[PDB]
Amino acid sequence: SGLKKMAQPSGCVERCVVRVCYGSTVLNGVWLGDTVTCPRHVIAPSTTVLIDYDHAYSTMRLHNFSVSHNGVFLGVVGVTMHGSVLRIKVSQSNVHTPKHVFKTLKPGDSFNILACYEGIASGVFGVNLRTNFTIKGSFINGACGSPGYNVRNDGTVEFCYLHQIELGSGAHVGSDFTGSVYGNFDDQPSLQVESANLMLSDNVVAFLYAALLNGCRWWLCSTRVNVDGFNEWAMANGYTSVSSVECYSILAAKTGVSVEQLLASIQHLHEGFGGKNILGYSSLCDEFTLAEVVKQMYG
Amino acid sequence: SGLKKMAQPSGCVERCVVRVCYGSTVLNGVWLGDTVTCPRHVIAPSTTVLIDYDHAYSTMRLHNFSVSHNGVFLGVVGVTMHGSVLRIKVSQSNVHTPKHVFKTLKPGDSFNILACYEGIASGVFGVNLRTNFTIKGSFINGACGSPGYNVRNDGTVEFCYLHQIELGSGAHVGSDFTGSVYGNFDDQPSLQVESANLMLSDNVVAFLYAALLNGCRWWLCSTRVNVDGFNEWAMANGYTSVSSVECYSILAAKTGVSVEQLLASIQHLHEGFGGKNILGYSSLCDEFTLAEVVKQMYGV
Amino acid sequence: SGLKKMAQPSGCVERCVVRVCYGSTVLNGVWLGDTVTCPRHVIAPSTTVLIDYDHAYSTMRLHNFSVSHNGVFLGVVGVTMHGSVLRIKVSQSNVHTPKHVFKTLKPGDSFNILACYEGIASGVFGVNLRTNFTIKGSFINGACGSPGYNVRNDGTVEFCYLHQIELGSGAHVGSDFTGSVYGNFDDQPSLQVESANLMLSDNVVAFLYAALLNGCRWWLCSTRVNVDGFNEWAMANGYTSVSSVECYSILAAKTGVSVEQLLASIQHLHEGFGGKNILGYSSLCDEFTLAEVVKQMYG
Amino acid sequence: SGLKKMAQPSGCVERCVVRVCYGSTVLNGVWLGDTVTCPRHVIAPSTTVLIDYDHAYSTMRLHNFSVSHNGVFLGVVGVTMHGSVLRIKVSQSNVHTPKHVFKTLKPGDSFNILACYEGIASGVFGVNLRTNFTIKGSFINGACGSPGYNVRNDGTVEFCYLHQIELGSGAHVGSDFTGSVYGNFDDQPSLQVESANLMLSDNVVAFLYAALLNGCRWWLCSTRVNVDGFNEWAMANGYTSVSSVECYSILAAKTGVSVEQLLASIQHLHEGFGGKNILGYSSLCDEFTLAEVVKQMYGV
Amino acid sequence: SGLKKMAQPSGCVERCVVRVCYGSTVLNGVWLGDTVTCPRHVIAPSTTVLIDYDHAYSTMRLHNFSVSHNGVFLGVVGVTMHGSVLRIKVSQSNVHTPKHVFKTLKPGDSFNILACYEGIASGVFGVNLRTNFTIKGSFINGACGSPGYNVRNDGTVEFCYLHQIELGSGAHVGSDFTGSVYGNFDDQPSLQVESANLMLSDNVVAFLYAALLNGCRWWLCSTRVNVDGFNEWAMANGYTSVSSVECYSILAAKTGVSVEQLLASIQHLHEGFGGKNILGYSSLCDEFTLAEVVKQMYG
Amino acid sequence: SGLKKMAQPSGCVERCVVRVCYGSTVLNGVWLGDTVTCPRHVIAPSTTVLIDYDHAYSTMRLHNFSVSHNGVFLGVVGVTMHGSVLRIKVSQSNVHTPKHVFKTLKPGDSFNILACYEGIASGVFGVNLRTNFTIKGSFINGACGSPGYNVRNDGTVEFCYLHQIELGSGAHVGSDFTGSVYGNFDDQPSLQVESANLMLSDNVVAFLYAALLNGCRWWLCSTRVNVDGFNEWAMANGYTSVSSVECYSILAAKTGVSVEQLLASIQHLHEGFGGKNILGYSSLCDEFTLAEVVKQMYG
């Protein structure tokens, strides 16, 4: 038993992480086959003033790149630019390239971040793409290029994020591997401001089912609210809508509690726990998806 | 910026994980050199009734073991018993053995757990050894033998935990690699009970410093309390003592806030946050050590 | 066990109730010694238009009064006017006059109303003087003059109310037996408007102690709030201040719960019960005083 | 205007209350003519273990009774036992005996309780006989024998209840004056259990009419449900059936709202009031009968 | 020290008991999630004549059910029939539902009965399922539906019995939660007769070990008998076979007495104690399992 | 039918048990309101040598206590000493505190023990206080502080025992909640020895009535002995006196057998059963009170 926000194992991805240097700027990239993807601001002349990327790419020279994996140098043969990333073609193919795919995340998807500095993984953690297209991570100077990923049941890695920016709020933004920045933020120093985050209602429901199944039941109200009424309340109170109730049928059956009862319980619990807790959390938790709760409780 | 509970990368440890089967019991072990360490209850005839380990070891037959790494079988040469673990000698040396050490944790030490099932890592997360010698993890049937570890700045892996049991409370207990069970729990089905979980005051201080440095400062009260007064309060309110204030001198200097101000702020915040939060946490957080906060805020 | 809003027994007061008629207006009065007290608007010429009481009293004639007790006529000898009541001197002294006193209620005092029509008691109920100097009763045309009372432990009746008016809101106002109208309302048809009622915090505390002592404990929060903080919250949320915590020391000792914990629990519970109940009440109850809870639980 | 749960005046009944003592057991009785009715467990040797009433009556001695009214002793002449009560014949006839009748209540009937201790009335309150033959009163040790009553329009007192016990739930049970216990509970210490308390739908309808007539109308939905559909819903949701709609014709006419609209409104309101209230009640109220609402709104 | 037949604590089960009424028949049921399990004879038209259950279920009407807990209504949505039980789907989910599973007992398993009347727990005691598929309990009219259970170390309740009948011998029979009656007895008034009970030899061995460990050793013979010989004797003398001697290894080691010596001692003690006793018992005791003895001596 | 030694259900008590640690000594305590009662030997420096309790209490330091429930901290505010118990005033009030009272048992009273270890209930069983002020329980190291209790019909818990010691005989002694040790034993390691137990004659009579009512009548003699004669015999043969015959009136009436016949039957049965049994017991049983037999036969 227990519920803990965890990352999927990082080995297959650590083998793809490299150090990318242009001039005196250092950040990370990801080496899959004979291509290294990294953020394009590695060739920026400054990163404090507004950047003409067209100019920086046109005047870029290959002899200024140095790309290495655990100190072993890779030979750069060429570079193309795709939105906010570079694809650096190199001589050597990564023999530890895992079976993989590129995937673009949607709000509410969970994934894993491998935080890297100078080409070396430092830390690994699970996170959710928020409704405002940011994440709440922990990154300092040098982290750009840290990858995000999921690993499917068949062993296939979905590469889905590369760290790009920290907004003024402290919230974090990346791009996918096509170079689209999540939420169309700009990979520029700017005064951009994210929308206010919405609590992910589907996760909050999953979490309350997990609480029931771990014998924590004090918070359960005996009121019912239907989907359309919860969704109206949600808009007013900083919560997403809830997805089809059929998703939860296995857990509804195992607990004998319907989604509608949990929705009403959320409405009440939003006002405060009154000093009590739920699986140790002193307020509602949207950190875990349905899939994560099910995987952690049952495999 | 930001503060997030992370694990150290798991690759060097995933290469040491194996599936250990005895009879029809399956769990995990850790393959370093030509030795696989695993929990000794893999040879128990039943995990429901009290176990005679002497009898289980005396009647043990090697031909009942099967040990594999990513489906490749390993040849079992012999087995010794050390407290709550077995050391299974095998023919093949793990060529991916990292440079390593065995280390025994102390309350308040942070470490990483690689949760495993059937010899295959499933997830990885950071955790703290609590005052009562347990951790709060997430483990289900099959997790026994999941390792815990730290990686030093030089690349050296400290192997420090092997998962052994879940207490009736839900709290988790392991052994070190010498087979000592943390907190002297028993690797037996029983009704054994942990002592009280105390909030780790050193971590709470670290965390509030992290909050200040991420511009979260609403909670800061303008009272001071000294160490000895906080420590007396702590005993009565479910908190450890705090270690010498000069530990925090770098962060005191960078924020302009003294530990004594934070201690007072803890006393206030103990009563509840009201509606508000600190780095998203709706109550005080003892999940981060000083070292972790420093590493996440500044590096090295 | 149980907690029920009750009245003190009405016999000693029913023996003092009389029918007072002037002209064609009938209402009730209270016969103590050789005096009957009743509301002065019994001599009003209309009660729909504004009343000159000075004129109505000056032109009043004794031969227009008829005063009776269970159909037995009383001889009227004279009438004086004191604020909003008349004191009608009669020949016969009420031989069933109980030992009594006049007392003026303060907000938060509980008392009993004997609702009367044509000199005859119809109903009896307990009520509280609210912070806005009204009560919430049930009275129709004819009820004026219904008395309110308390009975002390020694058998002494405190006469403390005589029904006078229903405000536009439906809230009820009376006078004491000196003729002062509670809250200085006017005994006239008017557009007067009471202040908004404050929930009586002292009673809410008493009630939660009663809930603890009847084994109802689900609502108890493990937060504490001190007096001064509760009092600030109260002002903002429609509640009185709380009186000295020492009042509750017996019940604090018997339950092991301090007032401060109950104050915090009130703050939480104000937001809604979430479909649960406390001694059958689906929201906080200020209907019972400390004295009433103690008397009903222990004698 | 307004609606408040009231008792009928208690004077004519207070004059019939007496203190009944047998041995060292004290409770209340009711003195009508030359007979005092009281609960038969006054002669029980112990209220802790199962009671042999046959034995207690056979070994009873008259000289152990003492009966008084406001401290004036009454002479005990004899005692018979009728179900769960005694009829104690006394020398003096109660000169304040009101004109009266004995009546047995049915579920849903309202009545009044005069709570008494040691022969002295302490409080008075209105109450309803529930579907499970209990009431919710407030009684402590010494209340047994407290009477319940109604007073007809002609002045005739119906004596209908004598308090006998508190069940483990806290619910209260009495007998009528013939000694039948309501709901056939036993006047024995036991673990006996009431059936489910059902909301009295007729009263709930009355109450909503009262709300409309006091200008409280926010809750009124513009759906209709007929009797047979409401009655099916009721069974599933903890409500009685509703009696024929024409009972409410006067109030339907005065408000312009039909019963069917109220039935639908009940179905909606069952789900919760939200923040709001109805005549101050934060949930549906079945405390008032049709007759009570009519009497409080219009008289006679 | 000492040895006493105990029950596992009953709190987690107590709050799952409810009162189930059909017509004028009242018994108990068990409320887990939004389902109440109870014996199907609650819908029997008469407990004196043979019952056509198929007919009684087909003609059953929902409006005849009344389900409550301590006077609180619980609404019936539907009913299915599974062997000798009904599953009553109900409106509210039991908020005190423990983590649980259903398990079917085997002869020799110990468990706990929570004896209940009208939905209320009265008593709790440990008991063994006998070789003849009965138990020896204490149940009177109203006990039907009393549950039996075990509690695992993690707090998980195994629900394993529901009381169904008393045979003409006074022996007691229940079903599991699937509706299978233990021993295929019939949930009908009948003249069915259980096989003769066999003494549980494994428990008798455990009991003698407990006696040794409590310093009671007067009975110990210097005979040895092996498993195969004891098992042959057992058949002839009203005893089960004995399990492997290895089961007893901890206790054999701690006492220095082998199973084989205890088996012989059973054969001798079978003939009578000669007025002496063992832990106060005047004849051999099969009430305690090995697990119980081990838990009580070492825990 | 049947007769089985039962415990009253343990839920209301279970949630009052806590783990109390001083130094390295761990035992149980009972948490009611904001007070934890536990045996004072938790502060003993050594359980092998004579203990100066006055000194141990005077030198006791609060910082050495650690009080928890299932790992949840509970803070110590202060400690007083009352006979053989400590009253530990604590920071939190037990929200699961039942309605309760303290009661001191008399010899022959039945009650329930909730056997506990490290703050956790393990077992529950019914037991009698013997004439020698001991009980025969089953307790090992760690059981100290296990509570004993009775539950009245209204749900009110009578707390009446706290486990303190095991005598050299194996017999068990506790204190009440005031700190008086039953029988004035000492809460010290010692060579104290209980008086010889007297068979509880009142219970033996109850037991024979239960046997009659379960159709077991082979033992019934056609001798009568009156109270005074039985009482004289009892003194000589290890039995208490018997109470008034009137106590048994219900059961005398239902069986048609008088107490006097049972008293004689006890005198005969004292000599041995001759290989027969009564409700399965091979000798006379004083385990059940009259109240228990009546509850189990009629309820």
Ligand SMILES: *[C@](O)(C(=O)NCc1ccccc1)[C@H](C[C@@H]1CCNC1=O)NC(=O)OC(C)(C)C
């Ligand atoms: C990022 O570009 C980065 O990590 N760059 C390498 C680097 C090396 C030394 C010193 C500074 C930067 C950077 C990461 C941010 C900064 C702090 N936390 C973060 O997540 N992004 C960045 O600078 O964004 C723009 C678009 C302004 C270049």
Ligand SMILES: *[C@](O)(C(=O)NCc1ccccc1)[C@H](C[C@@H]1CCNC1=O)NC(=O)OC(C)(C)C
């Ligand atoms: C542990 O031994 C384990 O994971 N065993 C393998 C297994 C496989 C299938 C079914 C059951 C067990 C176990 C881990 C627990 C279970 C729930 N969460 C955990 O952390 N511990 C365990 O069984 O230990 C003792 C000492 C009781 C054998």
Ligand SMILES: *[C@](O)(C(=O)NCc1ccccc1)[C@H](C[C@@H]1CCNC1=O)NC(=O)OC(C)(C)C
């Ligand atoms: C009140 O004066 C009263 O009861 N008067 C006698 C009466 C007889 C017949 C018809 C009307 C009145 C009256 C009571 C009010 C009205 C309804 N509910 C009440 O509480 N008060 C009253 O009229 O107030 C003023 C000051 C306007 C006279």
Ligand SMILES: *[C@](O)(C(=O)NCc1ccccc1)[C@H](C[C@@H]1CCNC1=O)NC(=O)OC(C)(C)C
């Ligand atoms: C009731 O008999 C009673 O009031 N008895 C007098 C008394 C005096 C002192 C101490 C105890 C009892 C009693 C009333 C109950 C108690 C709590 N609330 C009530 O309504 N009922 C009662 O005892 O009935 C039986 C049948 C058990 C004797």
Ligand SMILES: *[C@](O)(C(=O)NCc1ccccc1)[C@H](C[C@@H]1CCNC1=O)NC(=O)OC(C)(C)C
């Ligand atoms: C069981 O049906 C029961 O408890 N029923 C409630 C009941 C009892 C009497 C009259 C109406 C309703 C009952 C339990 C038995 C009775 C005596 N001791 C027991 O264990 N079962 C029962 O009578 O069995 C059949 C199958 C015949 C209905």
Ligand SMILES: *[C@](O)(C(=O)NCc1ccccc1)[C@H](C[C@@H]1CCNC1=O)NC(=O)OC(C)(C)C
């Ligand atoms: C009781 O003190 C106890 O349970 N203590 C916890 C403990 C046990 C052993 C070592 C350290 C701490 C104990 C209960 C006895 C022991 C065996 N069976 C029992 O009932 N009491 C005890 O040992 O008594 C004295 C008064 C000598 C301390």
